[PDB]
């Protein structure tokens, strides 16, 4: 006969959910992500390739993207908790034009001081986007935006917004399965599986309509979507060639600090050196629209021989209608209409610098995670700032037309913030290993 035997350490697993902890090369100026407070990453992480193994992956039903979203939001609130809260800034502002160039406003207002029995009159420039008119005095009285919803917290100037890579590790007794299949679209059975204890360096680069400093495709422009035929689902496309984009804030402001209360001060922009200049972003036209042809032809495989048309975002909030990012301190808002403006036929070919210039707007009062209230005030960075980014992906949205036409339009959709993390975690899935196994054998001989 046969007897039942139990095995310990069997190599099996199941889908599960667990509390993943951070891991990074600790070392120094703190950052908003508090990476210095997590476990230090190992110098030679182990990665094992599972031979003969095939596993099913679902980037849209993954829990890592959802768990990471909560952690990023929690860290953002934790970093802003000890900083000064700008509650006295909600005062009547008297603004005038700076001595289009109406992007800035020279506002003057009353303010408190360390002495409770004394006040002070100060002045400081303010971007027009972060100002709302009261309308009682028409065009000479204003107030800070979102002042009627919550008091924004000034970001601590000692912490930087640099998105250093952070590795997501699983606790003992669990593992992170990695898919090494070439050109995997993020869904289905992976024919080349691998395992690792921690994910690669994930840079929490917050962006909209364009993935910056993200991973690059291996051999071909990959497209991902849970239902490509659907209209409400966002389309994630990964590029193979990183399209370099150079942004700059030519204005040279003078940072001025005013003590609004005992032991706390408010930082604002003083006068501008030189003259006003519009912020913008440059990108090579030859290399940029060349990728559009490759992106268009790749998209053509999912829609027959129809032509591909790129149009600017329909309209709505500034966060979703403009390419938002951050040059390590200043939040940009650039109009991508100069990029997604073309039509590509089935035989169309793209065929000097001629760099495309994208005008950009800047805001100080910002809501990162589209939450009501909980706003943050970004202090100004002194001097001119420049940041170069690697465009490795795009967030597209398909219009919901009749679809019987000979063409189909695509728009740069902001989607959800989770899409930024999902573009990097599509290759991972957490599983719970079951070391206990049971199998029969002719034992007791």
Ligand X SMILES: *[C@@H]1O[C@H](CO)[C@@H](O[C@@H]2O[C@H](CO)[C@@H](O[C@@H]3O[C@H](CO[C@H]4O[C@H](CO)[C@@H](O)[C@H](O)[C@@H]4O)[C@@H](O)[C@H](O[C@H]4O[C@H](CO)[C@@H](O)[C@H](O)[C@@H]4O)[C@@H]3O)[C@H](O)[C@H]2NC(C)=O)[C@H](O)[C@H]1NC(C)=O
Ligand Y SMILES: *[C@@H]1O[C@H](CO)[C@@H](O[C@@H]2O[C@H](CO)[C@@H](O)[C@H](O)[C@H]2NC(C)=O)[C@H](O)[C@H]1NC(C)=O
Ligand Z SMILES: *[C@@H]1O[C@H](CO)[C@@H](O[C@@H]2O[C@H](CO)[C@@H](O[C@@H]3O[C@H](CO[C@H]4O[C@H](CO[C@H]5O[C@H](CO)[C@@H](O)[C@H](O)[C@@H]5O)[C@@H](O)[C@H](O)[C@@H]4O)[C@@H](O)[C@H](O)[C@@H]3O)[C@H](O)[C@H]2NC(C)=O)[C@H](O)[C@H]1NC(C)=O
Ligand U SMILES: *[C@@H]1O[C@H](CO)[C@@H](O)[C@H](O)[C@H]1NC(C)=O
Binding-site ranges for ligand U (CB under 6 A): 51-52, 219-220, 285-286, 289, 312-313, 315, 321, 335, 337, 342, 345-347, 350-351, 354
CA–CA gap between residue 101 and residue 278 (Å, rounded): 8
Binding pattern for the stretch 29-58 against ligand X, x by CB under 6 A and - elsewhere: x-----------------------------
Q: Which of 278, 277, 279, 253 is nearest to 267 (CA)?
A: 253
Cα end-to-end distance, the chain, whole Å: 11
Query: Residue 13 Cβ, how far from other proteins at the closest point, in Å?
Result: 8
Query: Residue 170 Cβ, how far from its own copies at the closest point, in Å?
Result: 23
Decide if residue 439 touches other proteins (CB under 8 A).
yes
Instruction: Give the interface size with ligand Y as a residue count (CB under 6 A).
Output: 15
Binding pattern for the stretch 348-387 against other proteins, x by CB under 8 A and - elsewhere: ----------------------------------------
- Torsion, CA 293, CA 294, CA 295, CA 301, rounded to 10: 110
Name the strands in the sheet holding 174-179, side by side, starting at the edge strand that comes first in the sequence: 13-15, 428-433, 174-179, 193-196, 47-49
Query: Residue 269 Cβ, how far from ligand Z at the closest point, in Å?
Result: 9
Contacts of 277 (CB under 8 A, 6+ apart): 250, 251
Decide if residue 230 touches ligand Y (CB under 6 A).
yes
Other beta carbons within 10 angstroms of residue 69's beta carbon come to 17
| 3-state class (DSSP) for residue 166 | strand
Decide if residue 435 touches other proteins (CB under 8 A).
yes
Which one of its own copies, other proteins, ligand U, none interacts with residue 99, CB within 5 to 8 A by kind? none
Interface region with ligand Y, contact rule CB under 6 A, candidates 221-229, 264-272, 327-335, 410-418: 221-229
Contacts of 13 (CB under 8 A, 6+ apart): 175, 177, 431, 432, 433, 434
Q: Which tokens sit at 263?
A: 């032991």
Instruction: Give the interface size with ligand Z as a residue count (CB under 6 A).
Output: 8
Radius of gyration of the chain (CA): 26
Binding pattern for the stretch 361-400 against ligand Y, x by CB under 6 A and - elsewhere: ----------------------xx----------------
Burial 89-109 (b: 16+ CB within 10 A, else e): beeebebeeeeeeebbbbbeb
Rule CB under 8 A: choose which of 65, 72, 147, 247 binds its own copies. 147
CA–CA gap between residue 340 and residue 312 (Å, rounded): 6
Interface region with ligand Z, contact rule CB under 6 A, candidates 98-106, 186-194, 295-303, 395-403: 98-106
CA–CA gap between residue 160 and residue 33 (Å, rounded): 9
Interface region with ligand Y, contact rule CB under 6 A, candidates 228-236, 275-283, 361-369, 370-378: 228-236
Decide if residue 441 touches other proteins (CB under 8 A).
yes
Binding pattern for the stretch 149-168 against ligand Y, x by CB under 6 A and - elsewhere: --------------------
Rule CB under 6 A: choose which of 212, 292, 295, 391 binds ligand X. 212
Other beta carbons within 10 angstroms of residue 310's beta carbon come to 22
Positive or negative CA dihedral for 112, 115, 117, 120?
Answer: negative
List interacting residues with ligand X (CB under 6 A): 29, 160, 162-163, 205, 212-213, 325-328, 387-389
List interacting residues with ligand Y (CB under 6 A): 180, 185, 187-188, 192, 224-225, 227-230, 252, 273, 383-384
């Amino acid at each position: 006969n046969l007897w039942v035997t139990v095995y310990y350490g069997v190599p099996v697993w199941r889908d599960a959910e667990t509390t993943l902890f951070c891991a990074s090369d600790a070392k120094e100026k703190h950052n908003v992500w508090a990476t210095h407070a997590c476990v230090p990453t190992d110098p030679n992480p182990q990665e094992i390739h599972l031979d003969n193994v095939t596993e099913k992956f679902n980037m849209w039903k993954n829990n890592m993207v959802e768990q990471m979203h909560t952690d990023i939001i929690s860290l953002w609130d934790q970093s802003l908790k000890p900083c000064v809260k700008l509650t006295p800034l909600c005062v009547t502002l008297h603004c005038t034009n700076v001595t289009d160039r109406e992007e800035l406003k020279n506002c003057s207002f009353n303010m408190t001081t360390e002495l409770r029995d004394k006040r002070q009159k100060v002045y400081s420039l303010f971007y027009r986007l972060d100002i709302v008119p009261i309308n009682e005095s028409q065009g000479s009285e204003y107030r800070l935006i979102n002042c009627n919803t919550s008091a924004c917290t000034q970001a601590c100037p000692k912490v930087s917004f640099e998105p250093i890579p952070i590795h997501y590790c699983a606790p003992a007794g669990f593992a992170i399965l990695k898919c090494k299949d070439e050109g995997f679209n993020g869904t289905g059975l992976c024919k080349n599986v691998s395992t690792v204890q921690c994910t690669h360096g994930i840079k929490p680069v917050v962006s909209t309509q364009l993935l910056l400093n993200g991973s690059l495709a291996e051999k071909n422009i990959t497209i991902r979507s849970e239902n490509i035929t659907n209209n409400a689902k966002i389309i994630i496309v990964q590029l193979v060639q990183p399209v370099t984009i150079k942004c700059i804030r030519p204005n040279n402001y003078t940072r001025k600090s005013i003590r609004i209360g005992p032991g706390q001060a408010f930082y604002a922009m003083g006068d501008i050196i030189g003259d006003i200049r519009q912020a913008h972003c440059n990108v090579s036209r030859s290399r940029w629209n060349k990728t559009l042809q490759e992106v268009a032809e790749k998209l053509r495989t999912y829609f027959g021989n129809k032509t591909i048309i790129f149009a600017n975002s329909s309209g709505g909030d500034l966060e979703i209608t403009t390419h938002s990012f951050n040059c390590g301190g200043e939040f940009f808002y650039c109009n991508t209409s100069g990029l997604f403006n073309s039509t590509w036929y089935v035989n169309s070919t793209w065929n000097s610098n001629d760099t495309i210039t994208l005008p950009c707007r800047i805001k100080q009062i910002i809501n990162m995670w589209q939450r009501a209230g909980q706003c943050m005030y970004a202090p100004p960075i002194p001097g001119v700032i420049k940041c170069e980014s690697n465009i490795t992906g795009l967030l597209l949205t398909r219009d919901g037309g009749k679809d019987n036409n000979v063409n189909e339009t695509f728009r740069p959709g902001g989607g959800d913030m989770r899409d930024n993390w999902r573009s990097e975690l599509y290759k991972y899935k957490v599983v719970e290993i079951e070391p206990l196994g049971v199998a029969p054998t002719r034992c007791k001989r």
